[PDB]
């Protein structure tokens, strides 16, 4: 249908989990969904529709960076009528308020991108999630015993940053971690009147430098997946 998704109209459920890595999307479909069908694979960016506890759920990869995320989110909403979009992924922690295995809920997404200035009159758009989705994540995390850390993330155009000197100031201003898409997901969902939320798993701390083991990374990812799937049930 679109240049970036070759799903049929109606192949997506109204609730979609998102992740930058299509191989992690494939992992979720294989391990946690029943009767998962691969509904799109343009550019090797996979998406699925399947069932979780008898409920329809879609998954979609969106690549790295705001520009990539924006393309997929725009088509999911405008063409495939996706209504709720829940991004899960990893991040680099920068605040002493979080450590390994923590799950962050981004109630705002700051950015060094110019995309929101281009969208929003050259002013400051405060990119935020849908509040109802954030309430649902908080309530589901509590039911599951997850100690959800809530604050801003900083969405960067740079994985190899030229501004590492600024990470301390970012953390002072309640930015818990750096990632690369949340500001784009949030601004696109605001633009198109859809519900979006970003959860981040702390696998690595950019300041204190601790990393999770390959085992621990699978453990903490599964914990975030279950949280996400449970709030969409």
């Amino acid at each position: 249908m679109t240049p970036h998704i070759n799903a049929k109209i109606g192949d997506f459920y109204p609730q979609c989990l998102l992740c930058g890595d299509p191989l992690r999307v494939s992992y979720i479909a294989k391990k946690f969904l029943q009767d998962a069908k691969e509904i799109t694979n343009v550019r090797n960016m996979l998406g699925f529709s399947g069932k979780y506890k008898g409920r329809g759920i879609s998954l979609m990869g969106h690549g790295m960076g705001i520009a990539s995320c924006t393309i997929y989110v725009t088509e999911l909403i405008k063409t495939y009528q996706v209504k709720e979009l829940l991004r899960i992924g990893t991040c680099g922690a920068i605040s002493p308020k979080v450590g390994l295995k923590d799950i962050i809920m981004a109630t705002g997404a700051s950015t060094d991108s110019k995309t929101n200035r281009v969208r929003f009159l050259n002013h400051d758009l405060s990119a935020t999630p849908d509040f109802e989705l954030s309430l649902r994540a908080y309530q589901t995390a509590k039911r599951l015993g997850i100690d959800l850390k809530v604050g801003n993330v900083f969405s960067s155009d740079f994985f190899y940053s030229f501004e590492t000197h600024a990470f301390d100031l970012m953390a002072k201003y309640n930015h818990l971690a750096i990632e690369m898409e949340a500001a784009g997901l949030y601004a696109t969902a605001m633009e198109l009147n859809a519900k979006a939320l970003c959860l981040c798993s702390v696998s690595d701390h950019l300041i204190t430098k601790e990393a999770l083991s390959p085992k621990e990374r699978v453990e903490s990812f599964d914990n975030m997946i279950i949280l996400a799937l449970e709030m969409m049930s």
Copy 2:
């Protein structure tokens, strides 16, 4: 004590209600609090401490615009040990999702100010409130039967806007109303690790040109005062 507040340290309770209008602050003290004492009056900017249903509450005026709000909020946090700041004020609606007398909870505060770029590396700071406070507002509104409208506000340096052609675009991006301080409150609370939230009551519609009458403004604002004081109980 500070250049803008002449209270003694300890005169403020750790929870403070904020409003731009010190005469409205005084109105709250006299109508809704018991044992209210005026604790500060520099520049005619009144603040009070009293009790609501047996619990200590402080009230403080903060003037108009981000620069004025930032001064008072900075001093309340750094000198007077205030931990939770709840702003209530009026706003001008720009979205068809809200009408006169609606109460808005601002989950983000966009802005045309340069203050957050100066604070934050010339990048985009997503100015947001404390999540626990937003949860408490949502829950209290539900308990009180208030249909709380949740979205962004646009915090402007301009009461008399030069960009009225942009209001529809702002509304498209889930900005429900315009006011002039929330981005400053949120950024300062982020800077200084305090908890802040902004609620606004729709007194005028900037699109449909509807306005509240003098009597209706008092009654609508009373509803927001009760919501704020019940959140702080």
Copy 3:
């Protein structure tokens, strides 16, 4: 009849002195004017009309910060037909060329605000006073034996500055002191074709850390008040 002023049309004289602190405005009315009447008091922001040497003069408080000052100046000019606006205030000196008790005339007001970029095509607006008013101030200060220091001021959105390291650079470029409203007064008066000027009293030096005593401040303030009233005579 405006949202921020509750005077009647015609209550203001065409010449108006301005200051951010309404209590200092009230001080001027009480000590220096004859038959002074309080003509507005919305938000406790006081204004007066009275006589000085048989001549009608008004006074108006405008609060702190460019956004607040702009609101009041806009309404004074557009609704209350004020034609000449003379702001007197305090400032923090940053230049070795001025010391305590000096009176500064701001022939330009630089700023870290975005307001003039929003007003002025995203270019650099050189915010300046009306020249005839500056001439009148120089001529009156001479007649009164006042050694008027003349130069730029820097109008900041920040009382608690994040750029104190930059004060020496400001002083190098002939900024004698920092305050928080002049650039908004000047830009608004240019927008609306009115005559404006800012005079500042050096009460404190942000570099040498010198400060006047409470009685020296009142004496220095009175000197500037007499200068202002004499140039409106």
Copy 4:
């Protein structure tokens, strides 16, 4: 080795062809290379090493947008010792000087991204290719009888542009087409002292709305693949 490439050091030849679409990279490996080996597959972003007319060549996908392209290019240069990077891809034409199936050589990449301002002192970085590579492309095109169109491209953060009213201005300034990665490839190669060039095939005209059929897209792209492989011989 790197977080986005799981090839061994030494798996990449020093010359690498780049494309956003890893499935088109796989297609090139299978149709045009002999003895092609898949050497990386993190995030389904495939890369290959093989031979063309007896000469070793590598291929690598880089995803969509400047932030994604920058990640892969940085790791190719810094870890895998790639010295020459030739990007081929599709673009949307915006100039009447180019039609469908034309091949464009980008001698400059303008952008709406903030990435180069962050890299380059908040000034204007002229993102350009290596001249020797551009000479080689021009000569090879002549040899192959290709009518190579030479000019700037515009690298956008937006596939779904909010500034379509500006396409004619871009074309006036000798921007032949829009794509989404060249400015990031060029700036990264300049940062790290490597040789880069971008060639683009016109599959759609954004002004005339002409679009190639899926069949002739393949045939048109094959011509650009051969130009690229020939200039790397």
Copy 5:
């Protein structure tokens, strides 16, 4: 002694008239000065020293645009010890407040240049003249019966403007005319603690389209030359 001036140290008087056109500078020396000596001629940019009514005066061309003006002004102040710089020149009127043959005194110089943002913390520098020179010009014009028009000018990087649709907005904000150097003269003088002022003669009205005949242009410019030379006597 500098790369753009080949005068000897001491060849300049401490008061210097400036004009963009070195041929008009030569005209002034030959028509209005006695004992004029050509003292510099690098790049054909002439400067002179002579006497007017027995008093020493220098003249110097500075070329077109802020960058050119800044070079010559910088060298005049730092190497040749010039203390007072009076620029005279033509301008394109944009305000109904001025007409042909009017002489404008620029009490501020707005600009579309980035030079002052580079100089001044990326904030807004209000580029202004020296007050004492402004007073002297006003007083001398009164003495000579000249109706001096006083306001801002807009110093553009563009003679062939791309923003002619904004001339009305510039005039609204008290910009009487456009020229191309005043903001650079003023900022350089501010940087280096020298006294500068710009006077401009209205030869063309960019809005009204009235224009001076070749004969009236020479008469009008002689009027401004006499004002300038009388000011420095």
Copy 6:
């Protein structure tokens, strides 16, 4: 026929050499052209038409800085029908890849000017030369045995820079030297669909402070002049 050129329509050949210094332009006409006629001299900015090896060639001075260069290039193209513009000049080297007597071909011109943001939607315009002209220079240089250094230059609004600390960063990003006009020449030629190229001879090194003697200055300049005239034959 234009405000800055007093040549007749048709006095210019379609190929024009440019330099900032009109005395260098005059030097070229005297030493290398036959039957050279001075065709323009407004503001002492000289231009010539003559013959080199029996082919007509024009020369034009353009003064210092982007604003000045833009004026003359605009008039040459729009009024005098100039089609190919080859700028030759000096520059201050900043890279270890070049030394004194080197000739640089600027395949891009970065800048600290705001001019291209004003021209180009407030985005990043990659100012580049015409590729065919760059090819001609490269081939002509090779024929003459000149070791042409190819890369970016940085076009500054500042001769007396306030950002000397950034020169190493500029060199990292393949900026070989600083000059003051190339970005303006390139952007104007792009605007107006003309062919432009800039060559720079390294006379001074802004890093190591090496400089050429007066005799090596003329020798190096002559080598670049011959390159330029030979390219236009």
